[PDB]
Design a protein around this ligand. Structure first.
Ligand SMILES: Nc1ccn([C@@H]2O[C@H](COP(=O)(O)OP(=O)(O)OP(=O)(O)O)[C@@H](O)[C@H]2O)c(=O)n1
Ligand SMILES: [Mg+2]
Ligand SMILES: [Zn+2]
Lengths: 49, 620, 97, 98, 89
RNA sequence: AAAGAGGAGAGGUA
């Protein structure tokens, strides 16, 4: 089973101990998997699009 | 001994199909071919002369009476009336006799064309799409390449391409006189008639060795089929139909309800459609119609035959009055409601009953209670026989009148007819072999069946709305089997695990628990001494002792207690070489390294009652 | 931000027990298990960097086998243990085919 | 005992590979004892025997490979079974219940 | 086995055995042996209607003589077969 | 002598 995680803030992103990993399929698409989990920090700010 | 030894199935040739439904008459004519979509006359309810219900083909509709009403009676043993051709015999012959229909054009059997393996496609070494396109008039096929350079044997063509080749050949030129035979039609009988089985078998066997992988396996499959057609000596072209059998008319009844109208049967509609299309195609072919209208009729005839055999297998489904598909021949033998799983592996039976169950105490474990209204109906022939033999009445009619009038004597006869005759009882979900059991019946007054409480867990039944079914054996062998194999007093252990199955269940357990429990309160008469196990019971019935008091009783035998100490709590040695050993629940007197002299047990009157009941039950 | 992947929690009870019996009696393919394919009988766990566990099974003649382990496959053996042909290594329902 | 009786019916066949000269085409399922007896009889003269591989069938695949078409037709897939039996010209000797 | 056989044939659809059993019970004699149920014959006719050649055969006891087909839809005994059981006389 | 034929929907009881 799967569950999405959303954010209630808006700002910059920082990684503490998460270690990303890149995997590819047989069609050329790439997806990123967290090899080592940890904490993901969102720092407040005003975001302009 | 036995009439037959084994059953065999094979493919059917047109000769065998014709032989099934053809019979001759002492005139020189032959009958058996149906040529009209007519069933019966609307004015007088009699069958027509050459339709689906004809009497010359299938047989007379009344016993020993021909169609024109001129020969009757039974003294004739198989003569045929020489004005209408109807044989004079019983109407039971309408359950066996078959007919046949001769088709204007050949059609393909849908079972051998649309299947998980396709046998026509495998035999012809062609994909299923090409074979399906040759049939149903969607493409042409080259049956003979001739002296051409691009054409190949068994090559799919099209209308435009055939037009181009036709222009080339019909240009009155040379080098093209190779007799190109491209026929877009059924055209499968010709391709199947050109097969040589032995040469292809040798070629495939030679080619198998020099191959590997999925290429080999495919060839192997083909080889299999080919060798089959050599073992059975069948012809591969028999998969294309020229004659069609017709089922006896008594298996598709018409039924005369509706006051003025008639009932609906689905096989008759399909047969009528097939006959109509065949007649139209024959008439069109007779007068030399243009060959663009004939192919239409051929296609509709093929579709009609396909719908008759298996509805919805290939294309659209035939729909009756409401948008509900009709029932074909393959829908009668197919599923849970088909012939196999409904009429052959299970049946309805005679001499059976059903009713609600109540609880009967004071019964024996091999006994049941039957209401009189059910019993007087389930045992009628035996009662009639005993009324004729003893208490000589006269004949059967007088006995039936006596039974209907409800004379008091019939009950006296029935009370002794049923004595010694077992009966079988069943509950609806039969999960194991203990769901059917045999009992001995006794007559009761009421409308409910009485059941012994000790057999409820095996049936999984309680008295809040359940119902049971009753069956009666007839022959002596069945009665012996019921008595010696299924009687309810001999089913003690479980076939799944060798554990007891007739243990006391709900209130007997509570009573036995209350009888033998402990009660620090209500200790009246405690400490008394008794001899025998009967003195304690007799004192209890007088009210002089309570039920849970602690008393000493003189008992010689093996005794087990709860928490008894194996070590002698007290030992007292007296003169003349005697010793008294006192335990928690016992007191034993012994001589000098010898035998016992007395033993007393400290117990409760209810435990004495329980053990005395058990001991007494094992001696009777 | 992310999409967590996990295993849902269910009850016991007979409704969840019969499907395993039906799967067993029909000889169908499970979704786990790693099976050793040769006799030898000397296994070295060889804990590598970034948690890349690779079991190495060493024969008496010097063969290596080199079975790799997945990210979420628990181990049911120890280091320096003796193993047999067809014996499971990393838990789960074995494939009988 | 019951589980052993059930399990025995699904672990007692073998798939034939390149049968030498006997009547055994590759891709067929045969009892192990029958193949053993046939090989024992055939190798007495000294010809080439057949190869095989054990298989594990399943409760419903093993019951559709019986020797009688009548019992298989009354279980499942009536039309396919009857078509194959008619093509092969099979016969039924009426052994066992059902 | 005898209970099952009597349930399947005499009590359901053996059109000739029903009357024999009833009259044997009434007269107090033994019940004669059964024959072939009607549903099997109905199934055979339905299968033959699909252009399938299915029949029952009798094994050849001796000699080279081939096995002979048996006609199931034929009368063996010269006795009546009414639709419902009745008390004769 | 005679006497019920199937089918399709909807609702209940173990
Ligand atoms: N779909 C169903 C429903 C009921 N049953 C039968 O009917 C029983 C139901 O018994 P019931 O009296 O309704 O309930 P119990 O479980 O016996 O409980 P209680 O009598 O105490 O209410 C089942 O065990 C089973 O034998 C069944 O076979 N199929
Ligand atoms: Mg209940
Ligand atoms: Zn006449």
């Amino acid at each position: 089973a799967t569950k999405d995680v959303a954010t209630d803030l808006a700002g910059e992103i920082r990684f503490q101990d998460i270690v990303p990993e890149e995997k590819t399929d047989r069609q050329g698409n790439t997806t990123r998997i967290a090899q080592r989990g940890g904490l993901l920090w969102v720092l407040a700010g005003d975001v302009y699009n | 001994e036995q009439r037959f030894d084994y059953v065999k199935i094979a493919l059917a040739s047109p000769e065998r199909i014709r032989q099934w439904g053809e019979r001759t008459l002492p005139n020189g004519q032959v009958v058996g071919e149906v040529t009209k979509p007519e069933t019966i006359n609307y004015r007088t309810l009699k069958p027509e002369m050459d339709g689906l219900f004809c009497e010359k083909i299938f047989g007379p509709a009344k016993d020993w009476e021909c169609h024109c009403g001129k020969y009757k009676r039974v003294r004739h043993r198989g003569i045929v009336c020489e004005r209408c051709g109807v044989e004079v015999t019983e109407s039971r012959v309408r359950r066996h006799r078959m007919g046949f229909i001769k088709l204007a054009a050949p059609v393909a059997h849908v079972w051998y064309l649309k299947g998980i393996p396709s046998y026509i496609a495998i035999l012809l070494d062609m994909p299923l799409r090409d074979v399906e396109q040759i049939v149903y008039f969607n493409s042409y096929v080259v049956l003979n390449p001739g002296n051409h350079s691009e054409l190949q044997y068994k090559q799919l063509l099209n209308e435009d391409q055939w037009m181009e080749i036709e222009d080339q050949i019909y240009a009155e030129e040379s080098d093209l006189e190779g007799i190109e035979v491209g026929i877009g039609a059924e055209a499968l009988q010709q391709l199947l008639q050109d097969l040589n089985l032995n040469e292809e078998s040798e070629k495939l066997r030679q080619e198998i060795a020099e191959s590997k992988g999925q290429k080999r396996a495919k060839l192997i499959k083909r080889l299999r089929v080919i060798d089959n057609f050599i073992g059975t000596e069948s012809r591969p072209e028999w998969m294309v139909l020229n004659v069609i059998p017709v089922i006896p008319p008594d298996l598709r009844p018409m039924v005369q309800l509706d006051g003025g109208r008639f009932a609906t049967s689905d096989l008759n509609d399909l047969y009528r459609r097939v006959i109509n299309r065949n007649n139209r195609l024959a008439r069109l072919q007779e007068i030399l119609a243009p060959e663009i209208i004939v192919r239409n009729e051929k296609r509709m005839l093929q579709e009609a035959v396909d719908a008759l055999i298996d509805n919805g297998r290939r294309g659209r489904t035939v729909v009756g009055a409401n948008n509900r598909p009709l029932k074909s021949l393959s829908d009668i033998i197919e599923g849970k409601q088909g012939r196999f799983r409904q009429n052959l592996l299970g049946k309805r039976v005679d001499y059976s009953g059903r009713s609600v169950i109540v609880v009967g105490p004071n019964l024996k474990i091999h006994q049941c209670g039957l209401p009189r209204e059910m019993a007087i109906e389930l045992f009628q022939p035996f009662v009639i026989h005993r009324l004729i033999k003893n208490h000589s009445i006269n004949n059967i009619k007088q006995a039936k009148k006596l039974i209907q009038k409800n004379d008091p004597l019939i009950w006296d006869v029935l009370e002794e007819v049923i004595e010694g005759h077992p009966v079988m009882l069943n509950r609806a979900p039969t999960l194991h072999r203990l769901g059917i059991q045999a009992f001995e019946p006794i007559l009761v007054e009421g409308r409910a069946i009485q059941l012994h409480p000790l057999v409820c867990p095996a049936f999984n039944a309680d008295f809040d709305g359940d119902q049971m079914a009753v069956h009666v054996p007839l022959s002596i062998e069945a009665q012996a089997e019921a008595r010696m194999l299924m009687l309810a007093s001999g089913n003690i252990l479980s076939p799944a695990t060798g554990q007891p199955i007739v243990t006391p269940s709900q209130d007997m357990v509570l009573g036995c628990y209350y009888l033998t429990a402990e009660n620090p309160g209500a200790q009246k008469g405690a400490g008394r001494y008794f001899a025998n196990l009967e003195d304690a019971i007799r004192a209890f019935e007088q009210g002089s002792v309570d039920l849970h008091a602690w008393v000493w009783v003189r008992f010689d035998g093996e005794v087990e207690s709860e928490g008894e100490s194996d070590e002698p709590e007290s030992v007292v040695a007296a003169d003349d070489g005697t010793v008294t050993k006192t335990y928690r629940f016992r007191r034993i007197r012994e001589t000098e390294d010898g035998q016992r002299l007395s033993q007393y047990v400290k117990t409760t009157p209810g435990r004495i009652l329980f053990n005395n009941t058990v001991q007494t039950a094992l001696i009777h | 931000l992310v999409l967590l992947v996990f295993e849902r929690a269910k009850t016991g009870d007979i409704i969840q027990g019969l499907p395993r019996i039906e799967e067993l009696l029909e000889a169908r393919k499970p979704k786990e298990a790693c099976i050793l394919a040769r006799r030898p009988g000397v296994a070295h766990i060889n804990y590598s960097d970034d948690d890349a566990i690779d079991i190495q099974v060493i024969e008496a003649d010097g063969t290596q086998a080199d079975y790799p382990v997945g990210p979420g496959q628990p181990l049911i053996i120890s280091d320096g243990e003796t193993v047999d042909a067809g014996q499971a290594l990393t838990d789960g329902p074995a494939n009988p085919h | 005992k019951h589980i052993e009786v059930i399990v025995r019916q699904m672990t007692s066949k073998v798939r034939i590979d390149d049968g030498g000269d006997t009547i055994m085409l590759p891709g067929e399922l045969h009892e192990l004892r029958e193949v053993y007896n046939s090989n024992n009889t055939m190798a007495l003269t000294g010809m080439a025997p057949a190869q095989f591989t054990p298989v594990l069938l399943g409760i419903t695949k093993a019951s559709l490979n019986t020797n009688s078409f009548i019992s298989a037709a009354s279980f499942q897939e009536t039309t396919r079974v009857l078509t194959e039996a008619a093509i092969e010209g099979k016969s039924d000797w009426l052994r066992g219940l059902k | 086995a005898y209970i099952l056989q009597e349930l399947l044939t005499v009590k359901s659809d053996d059109m000739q055995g029903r009357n024999e059993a009833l009259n044997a019970i009434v007269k107090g004699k033994a019940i004669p042996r059964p024959g072939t149920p009607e549903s099997f014959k109905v199934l055979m006719r339905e299968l033959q209607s699909l252009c399938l050649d299915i029949a029952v055969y009798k094994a050849s006891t001796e000699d080279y003589e081939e096995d002979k087909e048996v006609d199931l839809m034929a009368d063996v005994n010269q006795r009546r077969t009414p639709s419902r059981p009745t008390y004769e006389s």
